[PDB]
Design a binder for these strands. Structure first.
Ligand SMILES: [Mg+2]
Ligand SMILES: [Mg+2]
Ligand SMILES: [Zn+2]
Ligand SMILES: [Zn+2]
Ligand SMILES: [Zn+2]
Ligand SMILES: [Zn+2]
Lengths: 162, 162
DNA sequence: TTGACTCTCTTAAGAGAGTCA
DNA sequence: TTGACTCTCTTAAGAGAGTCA
């Protein structure tokens, strides 16, 4: 809600509820041939999810609280960042999973950044493979690698140069 | 169905037309602090675009040819790949700009790959900065770098471990 | 046969809001 | 007030198809 006190109360209630979500250990590539371990706090697969939480999409949830007799509702991963600017360079700030695990609500696995920055982590080589993200990745992106390109650049004639 | 000879004729007419597009020299980052040069063959900003070409969206075009009284139409960047498989690993193949310049139709600046592979090139460090794409990038991706993350991982209490 | 427009759709990283009990 | 559902939207890398002369 509007007051700083009320927003802190929202963040604190959220953390306490998510803190009781099952803690699931995931071993992850870090880049550089190394492996690490993340502890994700995973929202349940089906109702009930936890006080204040409801599913609005297969991998989408919202957190809701009643404040001043009014319902206030947020995307379930946005709550840690309610005191942060909601835009950057004219781009919307998004909740971004460093663990690349949608069900996880561990705020130690979340950052707040443009959708482009968010997406780009999918291909990051990782914290031991060359990550240059200023807010560092926790793991190599799941899509990092050589790709599976079917056909490369080519011409039949002689009209083009690189 | 069009014979492979008819398909080659389509590719050849496309190349002949695109080859006459304005050729624009662009200096680009390669990664590793190095700079290179790409020569993009850029479709005009407004009609007329070239024989066979029409705009279906702000940065979308199509190529159309009529053969034996049947109108055939393709996405304007897909024509170089008409003799290639159109999917891989159960994913549709997409035209992917190695120069990251949508108006460019130089086939030496295009490859044919999944949309995920395509997107990921936006963040690639580039051919002199650590690119691991098997079909190598021509330049560092425009979105490579430290990012502009507004807030990193954080908690107010002690409910969480990383 | 051709040009110049029109419309909606896909994907996978993210969102907001309404209907009932 | 709280829970459990429903629906459509945003973005930026890509698509197919219709109308008219
Ligand atoms: Mg993400
Ligand atoms: Mg691309
Ligand atoms: Zn996690
Ligand atoms: Zn990174
Ligand atoms: Zn180009
Ligand atoms: Zn690359």
């Amino acid at each position: 809600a509007l007051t700083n006190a009320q927003i802190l109360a929202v963040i604190d209630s959220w953390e306490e509820t998510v803190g009781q979500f099952p803690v699931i250990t995931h071993h992850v590539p870090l880049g550089g041939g190394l492996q690490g371990t993340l502890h994700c706090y995973e929202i349940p697969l089906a109702a009930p999810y936890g006080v204040g939480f409801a599913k609005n999409g297969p991998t989408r949830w919202q957190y809701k609280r009643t404040i001043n007799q009014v319902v206030h509702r947020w995307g379930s991963h946005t709550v840690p960042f309610l005191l942060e600017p909601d835009n950057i360079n004219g781009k919307t700030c998004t909740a971004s999973h460093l663990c690349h695990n949608t069900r996880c609500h561990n705020p130690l696995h979340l950052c707040w950044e443009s959708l482009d920055d968010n997406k780009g982590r999918n291909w990051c080589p990782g914290p031991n493979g060359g990550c240059v993200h200023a807010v560092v990745c926790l793991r190599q992106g799941p899509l990092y690698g050589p790709g599976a390109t079917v056909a490369g650049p080519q011409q039949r004639g002689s009209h083009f140069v690189v």
